Amino acid sequence: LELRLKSPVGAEPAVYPWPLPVYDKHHDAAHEIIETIRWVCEEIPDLKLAMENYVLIDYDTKSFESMQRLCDKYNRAIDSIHQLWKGNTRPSTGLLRHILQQVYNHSVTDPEKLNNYEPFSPEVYGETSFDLVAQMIDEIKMTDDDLFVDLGSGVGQVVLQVAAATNCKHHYGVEKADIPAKYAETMDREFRKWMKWYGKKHAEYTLERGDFLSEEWRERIANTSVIFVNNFAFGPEVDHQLKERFANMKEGGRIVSSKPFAPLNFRINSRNLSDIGTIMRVVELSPLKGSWTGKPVSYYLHTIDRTILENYFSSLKNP
């Protein structure tokens, strides 16, 4: 016993076993099936016209016959549309939210294994992070000349969201811990498969297991144009090593973080010449000021700017 959903672009069908998988106490693969059908109908007008929409109103998620009828009605409407078309774009924000959740649900089957009790972690990515990352994407406006890196990428959710939305040359995720890095391999596979099923384009990306403080990563950070780092729980020792890596970045290089690497009110003088604040601008970006009705959250945008240090020396030489 199984349920099948035909791809709107002729990719291999999505195949679900029966009884349907349960994700948590209030979420299961039946709600995922209904929402997938609704998303494909909303974005394919001819499909909405062909589909007998009443089947999406009256259904029983606990009945194999009811769920099979619903899947069959959708599969028949897909077939009618493929017949009509007989005779790749980026996903919308709404579809991407659905895809990322679906990818997670098919990949992270045992979330307890993550041993993650933090507020902005993989298990709660959809609550605020998705919206804040979307706001960040609209704010930094990356181009094909950019290289994006997430330092401590978890199961790779930020990398997948950014790669689906932007045209950076490449997106990298580096994760040290065993369990999220192993789950990132499944997230990668499921993301490519589902994006192909929907017929959606994404930029190139790589999720890798590694230590972002290693020698190999020193040159890699130096060549990165956009660093994303949720450093809130890192503490001052790792934060110190990161500032050393950031100090080799190019002019205009950017760092997006959850805790600033330099004070927001940094004032260069003879006693703090050694501080990272001498070579980077720092601003707090808050969607509540940047409408937003979510949590009162912020991120920090750092921009490599060695003219801060240069102006201090020029002012001493020309008082």
Ligand X SMILES: CNC(=O)c1cc(C(=O)c2c(Cl)cccc2Cl)c[nH]1
Determine if residue 157 is labeled as part of a ligand binding site: yes
User: Under the criterion CB under 6 A, does residue 160 sit at the interface with ligand X?
Assistant: no
Map residues 110-129 to x or -, x wherever contact with ligand X holds by CB under 6 A. ---------xx--------x
Q: Which are the contacts of 234, defined by CB distance < 8 A and separation ≥ 6?
A: 242, 259
Map residues 292-311 to x or -, x wherever contact with ligand X holds by CB under 6 A. -----x-x------------
Please provide the distance, in angstroms rounded to a whole number, between the alpha carbons at the two ends of the chain: 82
- Residue number, 258 or 278, with CB nearest to ligand X: 258
Map residues 75-104 to x or -, x wherever contact with ligand X holds by CB under 6 A. ------------------------------
Determine if residue 156 is labeled as part of a ligand binding site: yes
Report in angstroms how near the CB of residue 297 gets to ligand X at its nearest. Answer: 5
Determine if residue 155 is labeled as part of a ligand binding site: yes
- Residue number, 36 or 257, with CB nearest to ligand X: 257
User: Under the criterion CB under 6 A, does residue 133 sit at the interface with ligand X?
Assistant: yes
- 242 burial type by CB count under 10 A (0-12 exposed, 13-18 middle, 19+ buried): buried
User: Under the criterion CB under 6 A, does residue 232 sit at the interface with ligand X?
Assistant: yes
Determine if residue 148 is labeled as part of a ligand binding site: yes
Determine which residue in the list 36, 153, 258, 278 makes contact with ligand X, applying CB under 6 A. 258
The annotation places the binding site for S-adenosyl-L-methionine at 125-128, 148-157, 175, 211-212
Binding footprint of ligand X on the chain (CB under 6 A): 119-120, 129, 132-133, 136, 230, 232, 256-258, 297, 299
